Amino acid sequence: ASKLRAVLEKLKLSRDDISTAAGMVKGVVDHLLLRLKCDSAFRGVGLLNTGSYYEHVKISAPNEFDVMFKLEVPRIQLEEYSNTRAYYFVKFKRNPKENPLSQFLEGEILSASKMLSKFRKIIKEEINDIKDTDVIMKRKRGGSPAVTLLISEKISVDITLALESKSSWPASTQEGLRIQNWLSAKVRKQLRLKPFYLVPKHAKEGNGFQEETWRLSFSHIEKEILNNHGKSKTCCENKEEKCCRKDCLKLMKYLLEQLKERFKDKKHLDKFSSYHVKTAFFHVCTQNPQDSQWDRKDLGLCFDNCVTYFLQCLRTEKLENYFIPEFNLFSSNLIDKRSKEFLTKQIEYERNNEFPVFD
Ligand SMILES: Cc1oncc1/C(O)=C(\C#N)C(=O)Nc1ncc(S(C)(=O)=O)c(-c2cccc(F)c2)n1
Ligand SMILES: Nc1ncnc2c1ncn2[C@@H]1O[C@H](COP(=O)(O)OP(=O)(O)OP(=O)(O)O)[C@@H](O)[C@H]1O
Ligand SMILES: [Mg+2]
Ligand SMILES: [Mg+2]
Ligand SMILES: [Zn+2]
């Protein structure tokens, strides 16, 4: 109640930190975007600002920014890899015109691993010829489609290549985005007329990866929803309509960040990410579609609703991707049962003890 408000106060981003970080990031990102347009493959590349900073749910410090370098790929033909619902091979239809991505084809399949290698290579060469600014590239991770930069040893920038398709969303999405009773059927229809994205994250094949696979991304839609999040079009535009939706997501993010920090050397929580609590939070929005169910005065209850839904997800080992219902973020394949039981026990103790990990 009063204690949660004091936590939200401490999580607020400093105006001075925002001013310095926003300037540093824009300078680096604008430069790379310019250099990439100069390569034959990446002529159409455009910027999408995404994740928690641009959703206004970043907590503590503005020290991690996300951007998509998107690229329209006309006449795309997707093939689902192995019923995984989220991972696809990219092929092309008949096209008289030369394909600008020819260099990355393996037979008829656009190689995610080749395209990412060149993307990463270009960015690497380019961040040397930045001289005015201190910028290094961190080592490639199999988990992330992103190239990660560190600016002035303090600010991380994740850049993901993203193919843009203006086609209908794949069939795996048909029962996703259950926003009809919250944001309206007409908004669901408008969002589903927007493009979708594919990022070069590869699917599991036995011991390793199917290195040519891409994964669906709806980061653009997640941002649209968080920054236009009410049943009322004037939600949070006036003092009579201040909801606690973003406050509840910030508190869930802080709960996980604090537990991950406390066990950062003991492995049990390494497989959990902020995307787990972001996804769970969108599900609680579907369950609680009225702005009256997110009144600022009910912060403690609204936060409890998010905590108990997340606990139910851990116990049942079910957390659907918000866009792709048959994609289980909490499957055995991804997170072993012992890790989920360990997180459940820490979160139960926090809920039973008024969240001492916040104090
Ligand atoms: C960059 C950027 O800009 N827009 C989206 C975007 C972007 O990151 C993604 C998109 N679209 C995305 O899918 N990222 C991703 N996917 C899986 C994972 S994991 C290893 O499966 O947990 C992670 C991830 C890995 C390590 C640490 C961490 F914190 C997160 N990250
Ligand atoms: N497993 C995932 N599946 C799909 N999209 C993901 C996944 N992980 C991350 N993303 C997308 O990439 C964005 C950036 O991810 P990132 O890990 O930086 O988290 P975030 O939402 O910015 O929150 P924070 O950085 O504060 O933890 C997410 O908001 C989401 O749209
Ligand atoms: Mg982020
Ligand atoms: Mg990131
Ligand atoms: Zn609101």
Side-chain angles (χ1 to χ4, degrees):
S2 175
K3 183 193 158 154
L4 292 186
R5 267 287 154 236
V7 171
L8 284 162
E9 219 50 44
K10 174 177 48 168
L11 298 184
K12 286 187 161 169
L13 300 184
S14 133
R15 291 178 170 80
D16 301 343
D17 294 338
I18 286 167
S19 187
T20 52
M24 288 159 81
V25 169
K26 185 163 147 65
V28 171
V29 165
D30 281 355
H31 183 61
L32 290 174
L33 203 59
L34 207 38
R35 173 58 29 222
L36 271 155
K37 290 186 211 231
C38 296
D39 180 303
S40 308
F42 300 103
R43 285 277 142 81
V45 75
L47 175 63
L48 292 189
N49 294 327
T50 61
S52 65
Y53 181 83
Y54 300 101
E55 292 163 346
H56 317 301
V57 296
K58 185 84 186 62
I59 55 170
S60 307
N63 63 349
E64 201 266 350
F65 294 73
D66 305 286
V67 299
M68 309 178 82
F69 282 13
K70 64 110 177 156
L71 195 58
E72 199 201 334
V73 175
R75 308 300 301 158
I76 223 160
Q77 174 83 233
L78 290 185
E79 177 199 342
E80 178 177 4
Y81 169 74
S82 156
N83 297 288
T84 61
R85 298 296 189 262
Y87 296 90
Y88 297 79
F89 294 109
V90 171
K91 305 185 176 166
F92 297 82
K93 304 174 175 171
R94 303 137 154 200
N95 202 328
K97 297 176 183 187
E98 284 221 307
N99 181 359
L101 300 172
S102 283
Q103 34 182 308
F104 303 118
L105 287 170
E106 298 196 351
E108 32 173 35
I109 295 186
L110 185 67
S111 176
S113 74
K114 300 271 220 238
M115 200 156 173
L116 179 53
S117 289
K118 188 67 176 297
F119 184 78
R120 177 178 188 95
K121 180 154 185 154
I122 295 172
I123 288 163
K124 182 151 195 166
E125 279 163 17
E126 197 45 50
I127 67 109
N128 296 163
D129 306 343
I130 306 185
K131 222 277 169 177
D132 49 359
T133 311
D134 156 31
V135 184
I136 81 189
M137 171 165 307
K138 293 189 227 159
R139 77 185 187 80
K140 172 181 204 135
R141 313 289 272 104
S144 193
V147 172
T148 304
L149 304 182
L150 189 66
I151 303 171
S152 312
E153 288 147 312
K154 187 192 169 178
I155 301 154
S156 301
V157 182
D158 293 337
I159 312 179
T160 191
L161 178 63
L163 315 182
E164 174 177 81
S165 178
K166 294 176 158 35
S167 313
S168 293
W169 292 13
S172 62
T173 70
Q174 196 170 318
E175 306 303 316
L177 196 56
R178 287 181 170 282
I179 67 174
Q180 294 92 339
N181 298 316
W182 163 33
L183 300 170
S184 76
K186 103 177 67 223
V187 165
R188 193 180 180 265
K189 187 190 150 131
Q190 291 172 348
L191 295 174
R192 282 179 69 81
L193 290 173
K194 295 177 191 265
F196 65 97
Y197 297 92
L198 297 139
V199 299
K201 203 231 161 121
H202 320 305
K204 299 158 173 214
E205 194 162 57
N207 226 324
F209 278 41
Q210 216 307 347
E211 316 274 36
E212 294 106 53
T213 53
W214 306 78
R215 196 208 72 222
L216 294 179
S217 172
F218 296 97
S219 301
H220 56 314
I221 309 289
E222 300 170 11
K223 180 195 194 188
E224 276 210 45
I225 288 171
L226 276 171
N227 288 346
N228 191 5
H229 59 251
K231 172 173 296 296
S232 174
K233 286 168 193 171
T234 54
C235 197
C236 290
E237 282 198 350
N238 62 74
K239 290 194 182 172
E240 300 72 62
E241 302 183 79
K242 294 295 172 174
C243 81
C244 69
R245 285 186 180 88
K246 289 190 162 181
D247 282 346
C248 286
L249 179 51
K250 285 177 183 165
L251 289 168
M252 287 299 292
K253 289 171 63 60
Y254 191 49
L255 179 56
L256 185 58
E257 278 186 29
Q258 290 284 274
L259 294 172
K260 275 175 72 80
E261 177 58 21
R262 157 182 291 192
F263 297 105
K264 74 199 208 316
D265 291 331
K266 295 127 192 305
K267 290 197 291 183
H268 301 298
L269 300 189
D270 293 353
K271 286 283 210 264
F272 298 106
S273 76
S274 69
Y275 195 60
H276 293 136
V277 299
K278 191 193 192 177
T279 301
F281 169 81
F282 284 141
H283 287 304
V284 176
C285 287
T286 287
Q287 269 163 42
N288 301 262
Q290 307 287 336
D291 299 338
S292 72
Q293 303 172 284
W294 299 94
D295 193 287
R296 181 188 162 96
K297 289 164 182 159
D298 300 323
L299 175 58
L301 181 60
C302 299
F303 183 55
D304 195 72
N305 293 340
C306 297
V307 172
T308 54
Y309 180 85
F310 190 72
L311 277 174
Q312 171 171 267
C313 291
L314 287 167
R315 283 185 200 125
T316 69
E317 301 194 66
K318 296 164 71 157
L319 184 56
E320 296 188 355
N321 178 297
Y322 198 69
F323 298 89
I324 320 176
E326 295 195 319
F327 194 79
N328 186 358
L329 299 172
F330 274 10
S331 65
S332 303
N333 288 322
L334 289 184
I335 308 191
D336 63 37
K337 194 180 219 123
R338 218 173 58 181
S339 295
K340 283 160 272 189
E341 293 179 318
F342 191 87
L343 189 47
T344 296
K345 190 192 177 149
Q346 308 315 319
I347 294 186
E348 252 161 32
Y349 177 91
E350 293 300 315
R351 181 181 188 256
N352 296 338
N353 293 299
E354 313 225 62
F355 296 99
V357 87
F358 289 168
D359 284 344

